[PDB]
Design a protein around this nucleic acid. Structure first.
Ligand SMILES: [Zn+2]
Lengths: 122, 223, 93, 61, 97, 61, 48, 223
RNA sequence: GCGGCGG
DNA sequence: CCGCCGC
């Protein structure tokens, strides 16, 4: 699952660069949450960008990011905007069955896992 | 009976370690603490700060370079460097390449006591014409430090990078039950370790255990 | 679950077929002696108190393990009923 | 969709999506209701279901 | 805190004094383990009595279960070697010995 | 002898146990549930010896 | 004889939560409070 | 800057132990393993077997004696004795009082080297013509042992009792923010141990630490 | 075969 | 449906 908090104001980074900076310092303040309704990316994605998949989880393990937080992560060929948790799930499945590619070919990390999303995965 | 310490290691990245039998719930008493250490204490390397001449912000795009600042600063986190001695606390890697060439990690100009065991690591693709020059700082630390925590300012206009110190990627341990003639309520500890290559799973484990030992001793003198 | 049960199923025209071959084969493993195998070299089954699965723990495990490879052949009427058991005793002590 | 082919879930999604458009109202399919084998039913007539998912193994109760 | 890891369990957890009871259900009435023994002298059933436990019934409800599986011998075994062929169960026992 | 060995003796410790655990190696047993309704009413599992009285069953089944 | 609680035994509260003992955990590693006091039993939330 | 192991010990029961500074999360890496050992591993003492003269079974009643055999033996497992040397593996305390009196653990006839820190423990209440003479067997062990597991038989008509060997009732550890250091992100582990009296807070801690070290070495010979 | 409980 | 306990 992903979390949503409080949108203290303006959610326009969809275009301003003083919106990446300002909205990112406003976040450092008490104004904009790490998970704000900010179209393209909530400050939550601006701050943390994780290269390798592992990179993401360690930050978690050190307390930087909760599993249910919206961050950005570089996977095999795409810069994906998904939470650690989701990604972790991907790994678990990709581990269960060695064909990692065929793994993500059959799972949807676009929604929290419901009994059905899993039913269908099985 | 004595803990049979079995080892199954392939390369310098993966290392399975089994150790049984153990008394009631000891596997957990060992594994977990080893883990916390293996990811927090182990010393290694990570790029701290980078600086591309013509670049200002973290989110941009250098002409002649398909990669975006972010994708590049990311690629660098992947870079694994290995120092040879204490005298090297902070080393600044330098690299400049132009034109129609692929920029690999081996293109950085060699440093005296530093070694790059992450050669073929893809850093950037420079198109027909494409000036790419920059200086990436590297340090020896422990654990993970967010680029917002340390904030290194070599070049006033440079950008801090998340510190990926532990040469250990992930740690996993399992406590399955094992049989010993008389009593079946037994622990069997197998801990699997993943490393970037700078050090091996086996060396890391030992260093860990040592570090725990060194701390156990600090309980010596009362007051 | 089981070792290459997928592969196994794909080698037979019918599920139950597999079982039968598997079984009867386990029978021959013990009847005509336990050396009537085909993959005893390096990479044969094994246990953990010692490495003694090399003699006679579970028969079927062998069968399947042997059938996973193109060593044995199974068919409706491959060899004349009685002649099979006579030749086997002769070449297996 | 050739003859005899055992239509998988996907293939039944297709047919539905197609009926949506308006290309098929019924479906020609083998079934026990019309098996010739006096005492028994064959592979092509029973179908895809098995404890598994591939076609039914002959010899199943 | 976990106790195994000493690390907390993210999120307050409710705890308290709850009054709970043990029921007249001991497992003493719940487990007979029979390898072989006494058989009825009228019908040939592994009935029990004193030293030998009884064998669970298999009913047709369960045979079907087996039939379906295609459990040929597993079913054969339940109706023969394990029940009526006095020479079957015999050979079986011996063989296993 | 082996039988008398199990007739009154309390444990048999590791060795009798070593043997049992050895005899069960790859064998499996069947399990049955109260009303046996469908074919899955009985499933086969590899036994892994354990302490006590209860029988450990897999959650998914 | 004395009936000590063991894995097969079944307990339950006055409200209706009925159940059997699955595992007898060593105080060593079971859910303890800030102050040394560990818990006695852990009920699965899902049955409520 | 080296873990300043401080101590505040009052009596033989309570015993706080403070140790800092420590590097980011080790207070917890140490705190829990030691806790898991302190409760499960530490050796101690407990009433292993008892024998009342005219009583044959555990479920009997003794004349002029309010409490039942079961109520008594129960109270005996609450008895905390303390030996002083290995030479004392199995001690048998003997006690016999009659008439109008209250039997308290102090009425045991002294056993020279071994002492009873559980004095006022109420053993029983005697009416008139209340004849109670019993021998209670004690041992030095580790963990929990069900009276059914050992089945001690000094006298053919004695009844074995349940074994409670952990000389600690509760362990607790805290990880406070700071003492000294360049960086504020530091751990200050203070653990407070509670003992029935048999051994001391410090004594336990040390044994614990040792059992931990002992296991650490078991990582020696690979295979 | 009558009665009581459990799933 | 199955398992037990008792006149
Ligand atoms: Zn047909």
């Amino acid at each position: 699952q992903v979390r949503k908090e409080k949108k203290g104001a303006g959610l326009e980074f969809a275009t301003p660069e003083e919106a990446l900076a300002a909205h990112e310092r406003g976040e450092v303040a008490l104004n904009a949450p790490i998970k704000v309704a900010g179209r393209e990316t909530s400050v939550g994605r601006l701050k943390y960008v994780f290269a390798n998949p592992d990179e993401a989880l360690l930050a978690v393990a050190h307390g930087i990011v909760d599993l249910q937080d919206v961050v950005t992560v570089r996977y095999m060929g795409k810069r994906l905007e998904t939470s650690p948790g989701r990604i972790l799930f991907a790994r678990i499945v990709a581990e269960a069955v060695e064909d990692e590619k065929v793994a993500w070919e059959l799972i949807q990390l676009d929604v929290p896992q419901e009994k059905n999303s899993l039913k269908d995965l099985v | 009976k004595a803990p049979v310490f079995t080892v199954r290691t392939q390369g310098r990245e993966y290392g399975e370690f089994v150790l049984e039998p153990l008394e009631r719930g000891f596997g957990v008493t060992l594994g977990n603490p080893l883990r916390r250490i293996l990811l927090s204490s182990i010393p290694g390397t990570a790029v701290t700060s980078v600086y591309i001449e013509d670049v200002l912000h973290e989110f941009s795009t250098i002409p002649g370079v398909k990669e975006d600042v972010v994708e590049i600063i990311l690629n660098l986190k992947e870079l694994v460097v290995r120092f040879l001695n204490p005298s090297l606390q902070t080393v600044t890697l330098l690299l400049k390449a132009e034109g129609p060439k692929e920029v690999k990690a081996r293109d950085f100009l060699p440093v005296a006591d530093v070694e790059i065991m992450n050669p073929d690591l893809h850093i950037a693709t420079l198109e027909e014409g494409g000036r790419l020059n920059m200086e990436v700082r590297v340090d020896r630390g422990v654990g993970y430090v967010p680029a917002e925590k340390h904030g290194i300012k070599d070049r006033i206009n440079a950008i801090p990078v998340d510190a990926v110190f532990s040469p250990v990627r992930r740690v996993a341990f399992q406590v399955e039950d094992t049989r010993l003639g008389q009593r079946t309520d037994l622990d069997k500890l197998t801990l699997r370790i993943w490393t970037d290559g700078s050090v091996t799973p086996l060396e890391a484990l030992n260093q860990a255990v040592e570090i725990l030992r060194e701390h156990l001793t600090y309980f010596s003198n009362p007051q | 679950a089981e070792p290459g049960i997928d592969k196994l199923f794909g080698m037979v025209d019918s599920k139950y077929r597999l079982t039968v071959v598997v079984a009867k084969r386990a029978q021959q493993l013990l009847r005509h002696g336990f050396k009537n195998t085909v993959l005893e070299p390096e990479e044969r089954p094994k246990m953990q108190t010692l490495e003694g699965l090399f003699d006679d723990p579970n028969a079927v495990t062998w069968a399947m393990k042997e059938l996973l490879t193109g060593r044995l052949v199974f068919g409706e009427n491959l060899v004349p009923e009685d002649r099979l058991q006579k030749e086997m005793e002769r070449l297996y002590p | 969709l050739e003859e005899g082919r055992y239509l998988s879930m996907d293939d039944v999604h297709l047919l539905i999506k197609a009926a949506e458009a308006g290309e098929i109202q019924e479906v020609p399919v083998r079934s026990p209701l019309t098996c010739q084998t006096r005492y028994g039913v064959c592979q092509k007539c029973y179908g895809y279901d098995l404890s598994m998912a591939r076609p039914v193994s002959i010899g199943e109760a | 805190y976990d106790g195994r890891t000493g690390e907390p369990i993210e999120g307050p957890i409710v705890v308290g004094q709850m009054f709970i009871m043990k029921l007249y259900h001991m497992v003493e009435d719940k487990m007979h383990a029979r390898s072989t023994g006494p058989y009825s002298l009228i019908t040939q059933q592994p009935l029990g009595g004193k030293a030998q436990f009884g064998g669970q019934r298999f009913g047709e409800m369960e045979v079907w279960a087996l039939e379906a599986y295609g459990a040929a011998h597993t079913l054969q075994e339940m109706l023969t070697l394990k029940s009526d062929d006095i020479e079957g169960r015999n050979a079986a026992y011996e063989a296993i010995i | 002898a082996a039988r008398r060995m199990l007739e009154r003796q309390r444990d048999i410790k590791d060795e009798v146990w070593d043997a049992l655990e050895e005899v069960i190696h790859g064998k499996v047993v069947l399990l049955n549930r109260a009303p046996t309704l469908h074919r899955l009413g009985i499933q086969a599992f590899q036994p892994v010896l354990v302490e006590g009285q209860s029988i450990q069953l897999h959650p998914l089944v | 004889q004395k009936r000590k609680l063991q894995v097969g035994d079944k307990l339950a509260n006055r409200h209706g939560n009925k159940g059997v003992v699955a595992k007898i955990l060593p105080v060593e590693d079971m859910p303890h409070l800030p102050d040394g006091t560990p818990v006695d039993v852990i009920l699965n939330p899902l049955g409520v």
